[PDB]
Amino acid sequence: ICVGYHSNNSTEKVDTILERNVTVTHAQDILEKTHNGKLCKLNGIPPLELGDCSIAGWLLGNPECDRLLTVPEWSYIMEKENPRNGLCYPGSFNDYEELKHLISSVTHFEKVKILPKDRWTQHTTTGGSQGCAVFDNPSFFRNMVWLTKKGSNYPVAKGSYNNTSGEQMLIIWGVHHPNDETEQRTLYQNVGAYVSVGTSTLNKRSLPEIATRPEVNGQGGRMEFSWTILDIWDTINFESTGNLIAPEYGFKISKRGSSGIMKTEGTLENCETKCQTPLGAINTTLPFHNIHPLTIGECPKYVKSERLVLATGLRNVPQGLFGAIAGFIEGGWQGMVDGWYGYHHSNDQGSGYAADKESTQKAFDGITNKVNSVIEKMNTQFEAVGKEFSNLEKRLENLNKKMEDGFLDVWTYNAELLVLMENEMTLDFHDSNVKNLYDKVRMQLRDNVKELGNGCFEFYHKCDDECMNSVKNGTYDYSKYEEESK
Amino acid sequence: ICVGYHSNNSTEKVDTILERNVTVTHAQDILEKTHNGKLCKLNGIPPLELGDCSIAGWLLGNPECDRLLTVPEWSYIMEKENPRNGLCYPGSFNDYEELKHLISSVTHFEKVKILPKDRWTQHTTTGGSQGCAVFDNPSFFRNMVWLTKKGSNYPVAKGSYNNTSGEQMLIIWGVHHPNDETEQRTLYQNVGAYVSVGTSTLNKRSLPEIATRPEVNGQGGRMEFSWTILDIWDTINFESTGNLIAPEYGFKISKRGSSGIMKTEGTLENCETKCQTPLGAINTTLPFHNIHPLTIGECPKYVKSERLVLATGLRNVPQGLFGAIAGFIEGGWQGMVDGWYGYHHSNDQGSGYAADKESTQKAFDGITNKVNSVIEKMNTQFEAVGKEFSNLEKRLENLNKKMEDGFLDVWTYNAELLVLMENEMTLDFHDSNVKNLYDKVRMQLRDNVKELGNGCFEFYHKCDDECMNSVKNGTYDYSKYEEESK
Amino acid sequence: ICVGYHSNNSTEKVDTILERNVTVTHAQDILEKTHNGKLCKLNGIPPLELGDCSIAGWLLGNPECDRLLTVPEWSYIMEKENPRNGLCYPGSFNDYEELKHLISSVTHFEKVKILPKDRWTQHTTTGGSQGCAVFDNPSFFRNMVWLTKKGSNYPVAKGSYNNTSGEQMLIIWGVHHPNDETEQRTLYQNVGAYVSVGTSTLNKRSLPEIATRPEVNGQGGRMEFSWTILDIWDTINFESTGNLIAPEYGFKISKRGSSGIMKTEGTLENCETKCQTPLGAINTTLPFHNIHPLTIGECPKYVKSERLVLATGLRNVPQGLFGAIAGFIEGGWQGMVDGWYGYHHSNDQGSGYAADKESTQKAFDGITNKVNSVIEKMNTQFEAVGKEFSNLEKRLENLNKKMEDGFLDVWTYNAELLVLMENEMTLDFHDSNVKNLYDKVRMQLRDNVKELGNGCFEFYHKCDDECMNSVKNGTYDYSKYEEESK
Numbered sequence A, B, C: 001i002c003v004g005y006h007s008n009n010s011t012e013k014v015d016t017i018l019e020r021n022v023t024v025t026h027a028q029d030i031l032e033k034t035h036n037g038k039l040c041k042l043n044g045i046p047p048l049e050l051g052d053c054s055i056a057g058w059l060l061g062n063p064e065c066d067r068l069l070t071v072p073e074w075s076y077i078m079e080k081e082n083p084r085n086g087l088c089y090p091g092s093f094n095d096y097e098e099l100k101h102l103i104s105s106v107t108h109f110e111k112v113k114i115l116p117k118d119r120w121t122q123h124t125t126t127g128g129s130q131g132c133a134v135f136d137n138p139s140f141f142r143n144m145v146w147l148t149k150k151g152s153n154y155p156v157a158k159g160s161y162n163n164t165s166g167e168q169m170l171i172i173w174g175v176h177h178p179n180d181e182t183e184q185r186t187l188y189q190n191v192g193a194y195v196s197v198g199t200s201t202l203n204k205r206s207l208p209e210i211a212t213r214p215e216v217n218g219q220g221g222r223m224e225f226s227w228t229i230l231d232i233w234d235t236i237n238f239e240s241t242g243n244l245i246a247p248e249y250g251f252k253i254s255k256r257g258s259s260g261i262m263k264t265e266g267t268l269e270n271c272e273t274k275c276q277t278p279l280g281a282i283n284t285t286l287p288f289h290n291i292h293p294l295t296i297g298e299c300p301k302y303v304k305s306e307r308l309v310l311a312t313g314l315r316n317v318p319q320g321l322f323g324a325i326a327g328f329i330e331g332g333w334q335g336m337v338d339g340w341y342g343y344h345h346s347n348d349q350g351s352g353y354a355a356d357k358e359s360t361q362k363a364f365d366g367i368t369n370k371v372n373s374v375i376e377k378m379n380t381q382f383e384a385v386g387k388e389f390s391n392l393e394k395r396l397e398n399l400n401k402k403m404e405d406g407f408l409d410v411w412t413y414n415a416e417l418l419v420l421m422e423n424e425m426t427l428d429f430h431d432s433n434v435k436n437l438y439d440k441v442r443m444q445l446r447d448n449v450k451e452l453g454n455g456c457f458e459f460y461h462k463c464d465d466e467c468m469n470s471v472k473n474g475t476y477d478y479s480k481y482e483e484e485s486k
C-alpha cells in the first residue's frame, strides 16, 4: 500500500513568502483585471451626459448647451476634463465645487419658471452679447435675464418667489462687473447700484466691483454668479438698483444620496453595472480590481497590484512542512484523477488507482472556505472616489490625494501578503493531508506489513480486493491477518 | 497506554478559514457588544449639558438659555441635533464650526465683564425684540448690548478692553442688518455706518448689508455675529458709527486638549467611564467594540462586526493538520477533566484518567499570549470622532466621512480575518500538542509495547503504578523491561 | 548517528505571539533607526534655504532677507519654525498656506521687474517705514512700492503687465489699512479709495478697512497682501484711487509636482538622501522606521514601535510544534558550525560533526524570501507629510492629524504583528526541518538500527565512513546490511 498525492497537468503559478512562481495543482485569481470598455447605466439609472459642456454652462443655459437631454433623475454625471462651453460671458461662479458636489446625484431634478422674463416691465430684458453669440447674434444664458435701464431709468428692480413647489430648490443669480464708470451708467444709469438677495438663511448685498481687465471672449466685463438652496415654503427676495442678472428659472431638487462627477471624454451606449469606471464598466465578484481608483458604485477594493492568486491546491510535483509531498513520497500520480489524495494497490487482481474521496472532500471543503473568507469578508459600500477642488484648494486637494494613496498602500500590502501567507499555508495543508493519510494506513497495518519508506507498504500476507477496500474503508482487522507471518 | 485530548461540555462556536461554527473546548470574546445606556462623566470631569440650547444660544445669552449651569471645566459638550434655542434674533454666526471645535474642551472657562453695559452714556442701550421675548417683553441676548441712537444722535461709539485676565479670551460681536433704508436711520441715524474691530492680529470693518427678507421669528432684520480670541496682554478696540451689537462680556478660556461635541438628546445622570458613547458608556478592555463610531474617550478600535471570538482551546469532539484530534484518536474523554491532554492506563490497579499538566501548561501558557498579543498590541489614544461642518462644507464633510469609513473597512477586515486565521491555527496547535504527546510515549516504549493505532499502546509486559507513572514522568526504562518478548 | 541542530553563544531574544522573550540563533532588523543629521537633498536637488526669514518676508522683500542665497530649484524648502523677519510692516497675507504649498517645490523660480517703479509718474513712489528700517532709515519691502499722493492729489493709479515672460508668474500686491480716516487722507487724500486687480480669471476690488488697533512694531497701520498667478499671454491690471501697494516684480514659476516644507533649524550640508527628516537623512531599504513622522520623500513607513526584531534561525538551548527542537532532541550542538541541521556519527573512525548543507540551504533559501517579502513588498512613493493650516482652519488641520494618526496606528499594528506571527512561524519551520531530517534517516534505516529516542540511532551492524556518508548521501542500502540482525 502506497501513500501519495494528486499531481496533474497544471501550469498555474502562485507566490509564497519563501518562494516565487511555485507551480500548483489548482489556484484562484481574486483580482479582477478587465473592464467593459464602455460607459453605462449604474443600477439602470443613466448618467447625465454633458458632452463638451460644463455644469455651470448647463445650469446657466449657455446657448451652446441648448442641445441637452436632462432625464430628471441621474445616477452620475459625465463632464469633460476641460469643457469648451462654460460661462460664455466671462466671470466666476461662487462655491462652484460645493455645488458640483451637492448636485452629484438627484431624484428628481426639474426646472420651474420662478420669475417670468416679461414681468420686468420697468426694465429692459433683452441685453445679450457676442460672448454668448447664437446665429450669431448677441445672446445670453437661456435661464437668466439681463436687466438693463429702460429708456434712461433703472427703477428699483424687485422680484420674489415663494417655494410652494414641494421640494427644495436650487436658485442661481448674477452680478455684472463692468469695465469702467461709463459702461456702468450706460447700462444701469446710477452708480453705487446694489444687488440684494434674501431668504430665511441667506443675506447678501453686492456692489459692482469694477476694474480694467483683458478681453475674454472679447469681453472685459465679468459676471459673478452665486447660488442658494431655497428651502420648502421659504421665499427668496431679489432687489436691485442695477447690475443684477436675475434668474428666470429655479431648479426643483430632491436628493437621497451622494454620488459623484465622472471626468471622461466618452459617451454612454446603454449597458449596465453595479460599478462604473472612467475607463469602462466592471462585471465581477472578486475582492479586488486594479482598473481605476476613481470608481462609482459598489466596487472591489481597488488595489495597486498586478495580480493576486491564492493557492487552493498543493504543490504540483511531476512523476514540504510535513515531509509527504515532494518529499519521502517522491512524486505524484498522473494516473489518479478522481481526487487529490489516494491509494494504489498491487493485488492478486491488477489495479489500479483510487482516490480517497472522504479526505479529498474535507480538503475541497476547507480550501473553499479559505477562498470565500478572503472574498466574502471584504467590506463594500457605495462610493464615488473622485472629487473636485478649486485652484485655491491645492492643500485640501492634496490632503485628499494622500488619503487615497494611504488606503491604497494599505489595501495593496494587505492583499499582497494575504496571498503569500495562505499560499504557504494552503500548500502545507495538502502536504499535511497526505502525510496524515500515510498514517491512517500505517497505524492500521502496523507490523502486518513492511513500510518501504517510499510511501508504499508491502503486505506480510494476502489482501484480496475486499481487504484492500477495508483499509481505505477505515476498518482493517489486525486481530486476524496477524497470524500470518513471513 | 493511550494518547488523547480533553473534551468537555462546551457549546461555544468559533469560525475558521476552512469551516464555520466549529465547536471548541474554550474560546474568547474580544468584541465588546454592550453599553452602559446612560451618559456620564468622562474621567470624573462632567460634560456641558445644553439641553435644547445651541452653542451660539448659550454664548450669546439667548434669554431661553438663561437656565444653564456652567462648570468652568467640562470634558465634552452635549448638544441636541437641532436645538430650539439658537440665535433668537435671526441672523448668522461666522466660522461657527471652527468655534465649536475650538471650544471642544476647556480648563477652565470663565465669563468676565469687559465693556460694562452702562458705560455707553452717549447711546441707547436698551433695545430688545419680540424675537428674544422674555415674559414676554422685547428683550435681547443677555451677554450682548444693542447700541441705538440717543435722542436723535448716534455719536461715534468707542470701546476697548485690554486682556489683563491672564488667559486667552473669546470675544463675540455683532452687526445688525436692517430691512430698509429707513429702519437704518430710525435706529442708528446715519447711513453708511460701520463697525470696526481691531487687535494685533484682527482687522475688520463692516458695513450693514441691507435686503428685503422674509420674517424669521417675525423679524426681517438679521444679526451677523463674529468672534475672535484676544491674546494675553493684547487689546481689542471697537469703533462704530452705528449698527454694532457690542459684547458686554468676554470669556476667559484655557485649553489643554481637543475633545468634541456629542450630539444626543439625553441627560447625564452621574456615573463614569474612560469612554462615552452617544448611546451609552462603555466599560471594557477588549480590542474592539461595535456600539457606535462617534465615541469620546479612549476607545476599543470600533469595528463593524457582529462578533469576534478567538479559539483558545481545541476542537471539541465528543463520543486535523496533525492527524491526532478527531483523527486517528477517534474522540475525546469526557472523563479527563484536569487538563487538555493526558493518559489513561489499564493496570493491575484500576485506573483511570490523568492529564499531563506539563504539556497542558505549555498550551495554556502559549494560547494566553496569543489572546493577549491580539489585544495588548492594539494602539489606543484619546480621540473624538464626530466633527461639525457647515452647509457649504459638504465636500469637506464627505472627505471626512470617506476617511472614517476607510479606516472602518480596514479595522473590520483586519480583525475579522485575524480571528479566522489564528483559529485555524489555535486548533491545529492543539492537534499538534496531542500527536506530539503520542510520540513522547511511542518513542519511549518502542517495541516494548504494541501500537494499537487507536491512540492506545498495549504493553508487551507488566507495568505497575510506578512504571506507568514513569512514562508520564518522561523517564521510562527500555533497557530493563526489554527482556520479555510476546 | 545523531541528528541534532545548530546553535551559538547568542542572547538575541526574539518575540512570538505565545512566548515573551525567545533566545534564538539568528535574527534580523526591519525598522531602520539611523540617519545622517545632515539635511541633504532629494534625488539631487537642494532645498530653498530660508534662515530666520519667512516665505513672505522673502518674496515681499523684507530688507532682512537680503542676506540670502536663492536658488533656481528646490525639492523642498527649509523654513524656521517661527521665522524672525517676515512682515516688518504688520499685516495679513491672504491664502498664505495655499501659496506656501504651491512654491514648496519648483523648477524654476525667477524674479522679473514687471512694473518699473519710476513710471508711476503721477504718484509718490517713496513711501516707507521704520517698521521696515535698513540702516536704519525708513524703508520697506524691496519688491513693493507704497504708492502715495504727490502734491495734494492722488490721481487714479493704473498699472498693466501683459505677461510676456513665457513662464507663469506669481504676482503679489498689497493694501494699506491706515490707523484712522485722517491718516488716510494724509497719505492718500481721499476716503473711498478702492484697489482693483483683474485678470482673465481674477477680479477683486477691496477698500481700506480702517480700524483702531494696537501697535505691532510700534506700527498701528496694517498691510494686507494677496496673490494670484497671471497666466501666459494674459495680463494682470491695477487700478486704485488710493491704498494700493504695488508689485515691482512678478516671478516666473515652473512646476512639475508637489512637495512639503520642513520645519527645521539646521542648514543643508551638500550631500544626498532620498528621504529627509527634521532630524536627518534616512538611507535604507527596510519597510519601516521611527526617526520622525514628518518625512519628505521616498521613505519607509513610520510606525510607532520601539524595536522590530524579526527572526532568522531556530530557537536556542545548547547542552516546538514538531517535537524535535528543544524537545525529544534535548539540545543543540555548539560543535556543529557549518550549517543549521546535521549529523554526528560514532564510527570505527572518530568523528565528528557534519551539517547537512542541502537542507540547511533550503532553509537559508526560504527564510531569505520571508525576510525579503516582508521588506520588498512595502509600497513606497514620494511624499511630504507636514502641511500648514491657518488659525481658522483648526478643524481641517485636525482632520489631517487624525488621518495621519489613523494610518500610523494601522502601519504599527500591522508591522508589530507581522513580526510576532512569522516568528512563531520561522521557529516552527526550523523545528520542522529537523524532525523532517530525523525521518529522512529513520525511514532509510528502519530496523537495520535501533531508535534511541534522544535523536540518535544505534546501528545493528557496521557502518564505515562510506556507509555513514551514504545515509547523508540520501542513498542508503537496506537490501544489503539487512543481513546482520541482532
Ligand SMILES: CC(=O)N[C@H]1[C@H]([C@H](O)[C@H](O)CO)O[C@@](OC[C@H]2O[C@@H](O)[C@H](O)[C@@H](O)[C@H]2O)(C(=O)O)C[C@@H]1O
Pocket (backbone or CB within 6 Å): B126, B127, B128, B129, B130, B131, B138, B146, B148, B178, B179, B187, B218, B219, B220, B221, B222
Ligand atoms: C432696539 C429696537 O429697535 N428693537 C425693536 C425691533 C427692531 O427695530 C427690529 O426688530 C429690527 O428688524 O423691532 C421690534 O418691532 C418690529 C416691528 O416693526 C413694526 O414695523 C411692525 O408693525 C411689526 O410687525 C414688527 O415687525 C421687534 O420687537 O423686533 C421692536 C423692538 O423693540
Ligand SMILES: CC(=O)N[C@H]1[C@H]([C@H](O)[C@H](O)CO)O[C@@](O)(C(=O)O)C[C@@H]1O
Pocket (backbone or CB within 6 Å): C126, C127, C128, C129, C130, C131, C138, C146, C148, C177, C178, C179, C183, C187, C219, C220, C221, C222
Ligand atoms: C508712507 C508713509 O507715509 N509712511 C509713514 C508711516 C505711515 O504713515 C504709517 O505707518 C501708516 O500706518 O508712519 C511713520 O511714522 C513710520 O512708519 O515710521 C512715518 C512713515 O514715513
